[PDB]
Nucleic acid binder design. Structure first.
Ligand code: AMP
Lengths: 182, 196, 178, 104
RNA sequence: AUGUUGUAAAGCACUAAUGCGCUGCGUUAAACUUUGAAGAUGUCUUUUAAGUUGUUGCCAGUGGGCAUACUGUGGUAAGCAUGGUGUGCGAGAAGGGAUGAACCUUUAAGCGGGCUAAGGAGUCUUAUGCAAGGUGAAUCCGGCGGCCUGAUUUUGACAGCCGAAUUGGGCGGCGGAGA
RNA sequence: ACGCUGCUUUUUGAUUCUUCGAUGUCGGCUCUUCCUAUCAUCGCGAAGCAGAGAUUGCGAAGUGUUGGAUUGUUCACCCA
């Protein structure tokens, strides 16, 4: 324990923060973000243009919460300045996996996939667009948010899995291979 | 013989701590109406409150369910039943005390400019779990209550037209103030004061 | 400011006792012992002094003599310092040792404060504890981190508990009772 | 507002909030040592205090150097048996009976 | 003041048992005792304290008991069966334990004035507060400004150049599986 | 394996507290409801899971769980 603990989050040149009662609003040269913090028992303010977080007489579960809230704010800052971009790759043994884009990178269709007549359809989470890279069979997902880019990729991996057969032999699916920058 | 009346507002009030005090007023001959009955709270998590309401629904006379216990899903009817079971209501002194109670979701139209009170010990911020609670309206909407959006509407329209009435009243307090500080005003009133 | 319940006068007291075996004509003028005891009650202090002699020597209360019993009074001027308290205590299954520093305004106020903390953390009454010694620790022989941090000057912190500023049953709807 | 050596305080109830004291010792997060305006030192818990917005420095101040910083008690004894407070209510009644015909 | 005793515990001196080492170490006893309590039980002295009965007539009911604190015996055990010492219900109301033959207080409804006991002081229902922690077995798991013991480190530890604490065993409260 | 700790009230004992101025004593047929320690159907783990067929585990009691020969039988045992 301690009597006081303090954390600092640096705000770079382009980002411009704003605070309306525990609610933080960022705006960089890639979009906006609203990072709400009304439910946490900690103190917020902007000191020398930076974010400051304080905690008085916290035990160990409140100290673990103060460090996780600090690292969600630096994720929201680098979303509206550099962005996020994930890259996925489809692999197979016998049946080619055909992929299509329906809206402006809002829907992703997945054809044959192990001889299926069914057509899987995925909808990207808010403020994320799906694109098509040019290696040979690769897609890219981009947007000004880590929450939506990583949840859209994790759904696609979780839903292509070859039910009821040995997973050591039927190794087909779509995996993440590069977590990068816009 | 008594003729006193009290309007009680339940917005951040623990539901059990308010019911025990409202029932002691009814027994001592006071008329009570509780408004905004859907905004009372239960300390804890929503998973703990749904498990307790689910065991309540299980109680049921197997021989004939029409005789059986009756499970009310409206916030005004459910909170009235918590006050009733604070007291001995089968006896005639308890029947009279239940005649002095009224309950509402939102605020009805007739009680528009009259003052409301809160109970000093039922504020949720005096417990050790401030910011972990469920309102009575969110819990009951998950078992059948339909009119949760029509209750928030009716309350805000009355709040706004109860705030305008305060602006008209405050400005007259300034126009009357300057008249009391006048010249022909005082020399008049000093004459009425002159004839005791 | 008043508190309305007096918290500045402790419940514990201190006594300095001289004792002996009861003289005979086969053993006239026996040996004299002395010690201090923390407890309530002049009467409680004498019985505990004889349970001490009976377990090391074999002198019992029915064959013993109390020669002197003095109560040490509280200090007149109040000031916060650091203390250290040796003691043993009885459990569901045995007897144990402990050390436990703290801050107080006297030796008997410091024992009341240590008992007050063993009642929530280990669930002991007060009769399951025996005090071996109490003394003042200067500033740099401190063994615990909690006392080193509060013993500093220029300490500062806000408080987050609420306050009841009225003793009515019903308050107007927009009043903020804290 | 913070707890520190030299902060002024007042009791919690809003009545009986016309007396003052100063903090001259810190025991733990719950208990402090106070010195009242009269000279007495007492132990109180922070759930019975109301922190004021003025603070001082007390380093070598012994007991009386440190007792001249406490403000004085702002309490007024009362009078006006029944006839004194009858006139004041009499003066105002004529105002509304006049202020009605003037509208407002 | 002066006699009697062979239990509990302990022990191997007798009777009966029990492993090793080649004098020691290890384990036992309702029908074993070299020892041996707490407690019981005789007599003298009121020329010790404190307190304040003898002889005999005429006659009733009763001879299925039960509970409990402590303590034995038989039984895998039982709200089972059967002994010992005290106190109850029986033949005992009233206040309290939500409810109850036997539990805790206390021993019996006249008319007034005072105070307590057991048990309690959000509400049914008469009556206040202050503080510290917190949010059914074997057998396992976590935590704590708790305590006891060890080791490593500004001559740069632990984790993966960095700059400050890291860690092994236990104990006492608390929570979770087994359910 | 050798040992050790539990739960249920469906077996059969052990006991004798209630009923002898009487509580109609086995099985089948008919009809309703409840339990979960799940047989099938729905979802999901492990493998000495290649596929097929099965084996073992978890969530789950909504709905289903038949027709006959021999025996008074409960039970049992065969056929479809
Ligand atoms: N220990 C603490 N350290 C820092 N901020 C706190 C702490 N406890 C509460 N807060 C914050 O301070 C405010 C508490 O004051 P209040 O909302 O008036 O009860 C809220 O904004 C909390 O998020």
């Amino acid at each position: 324990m301690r009597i006081l603990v303090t954390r600092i989050v640096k705000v770079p040149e382009d980002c411009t923060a704003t605070q309306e009662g525990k609610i933080f609003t960022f705006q960089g040269p890639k979009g906006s973000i609203v990072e709400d913090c009304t439910r946490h028992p900690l103190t917020f303010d902007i000191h020398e243009g930076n974010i400051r977080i304080r905690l008085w007489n916290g035990k160990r579960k409140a100290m673990a919460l103060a460090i996780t809230v600090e690292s969600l704010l630096r994720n929201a800052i680098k979303a509206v300045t550099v962005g996020f971009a994930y890259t996925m790759k489809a692999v197979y043994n016998h049946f080619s996996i055909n992929m299509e884009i329906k809206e402006d990178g809002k829907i992703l269709l997945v054809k044959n996939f192990l001889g299926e007549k069914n057509v899987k359809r995925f909808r990207m989470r808010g403020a994320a667009r799906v694109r098509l890279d040019e290696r040979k069979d690769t897609i890219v997902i981009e947007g000004p948010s880590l929450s939506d880019v990583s949840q859209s990729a994790g759904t696609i991996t979780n839903e292509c899995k070859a039910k009821n057969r040995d997973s050591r032999v039927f190794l087909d699916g779509i995996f993440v291979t590069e977590r990068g920058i816009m | 013989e008594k003729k006193e009346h009290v309007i009680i507002d339940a917005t951040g009030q623990v539901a059990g701590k308010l019911a025990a005090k409202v029932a002691k007023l009814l027994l001592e001959g006071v008329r009570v109406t509780v408004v905004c009955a859907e905004e009372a709270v239960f300390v804890g998590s929503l998973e703990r409150a749904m498990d307790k309401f689910k065991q309540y629904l299980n109680k049921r006379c197997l021989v004939n369910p029409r005789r059986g216990p009756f499970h009310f899903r409206e916030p005004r009817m459910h909170l009235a039943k918590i006050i009733r079971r604070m007291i001995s209501y089968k006896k005639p002194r308890g029947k009279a005390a239940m005649s002095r109670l009224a309950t509402y979701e939102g605020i009805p139209r007739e009680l528009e400019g009259q003052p409301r009170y809160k109970v000093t010990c039922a504020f949720v911020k005096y417990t050790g779990n401030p910011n972990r609670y469920v309102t009575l309206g969110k819990l009951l909407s998950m078992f059948g209550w339909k009119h949760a959006e029509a209750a928030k509407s009716l309350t805000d329209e009355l709040k706004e037209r109860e705030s305008l009435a305060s602006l008209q009243k405050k400005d007259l307090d300034k126009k009357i103030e300057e008249l009391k500080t006048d010249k022909n005003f005082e020399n008049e009133v000093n004459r009425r004061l002159a004839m005791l | 400011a008043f508190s309305k319940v007096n918290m500045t006068i402790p419940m514990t007291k201190e006594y300095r006792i001289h004792g002996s075996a009861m003289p005979t004509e086969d053993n006239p003028r026996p040996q004299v012992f002395v010690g201090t005891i923390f407890t309530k009650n002049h009467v409680f202090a004498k019985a505990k002094f004889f349970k001490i002699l009976e377990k090391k020597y074999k002198i019992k209360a029915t064959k013993g003599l109390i020669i002197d019993c003095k109560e040490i009074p509280e200090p007149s001027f109040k000031e916060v310092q650091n203390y250290g308290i040796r003691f043993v205590y009885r459990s569901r299954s045995g007897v144990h040792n402990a050390y436990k520093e703290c801050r107080a305004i006297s030796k008997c106020w410091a024992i009341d404060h240590v008992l007050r903390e063993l009642a929530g953390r280990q669930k002991l009454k007060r009769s399951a504890v025996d005090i071996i010694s109490v003394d003042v620790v200067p500033v740099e022989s401190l063994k615990r981190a909690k006392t080193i941090e509060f013993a500093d000057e220029n300490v500062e912190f806000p408080i987050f508990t609420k306050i009841v500023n009225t003793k009515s049953l019903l308050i107007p709807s927009e009043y903020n009772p804290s | 507002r913070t707890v520190r050596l030299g902060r002024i305080v007042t009791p919690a109830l809003k009545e009986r909030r016309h007396t003052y004291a100063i903090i001259v010792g810190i025991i733990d997060v719950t208990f402090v040592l106070l010195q009242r305006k009269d000279g007495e030192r007492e132990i109180c818990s922070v759930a019975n205090l109301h922190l004021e917005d003025e603070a001082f420095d007390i380093k070598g101040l012994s007991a009386e150097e440190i007792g001249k910083l406490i403000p004085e008690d702002t309490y007024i004894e009362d009078t006006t048996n029944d006839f004194d407070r009858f006139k004041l209510k009499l003066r105002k009644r004529v105002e509304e009976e006049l202020l009605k015909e003037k509208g407002l």
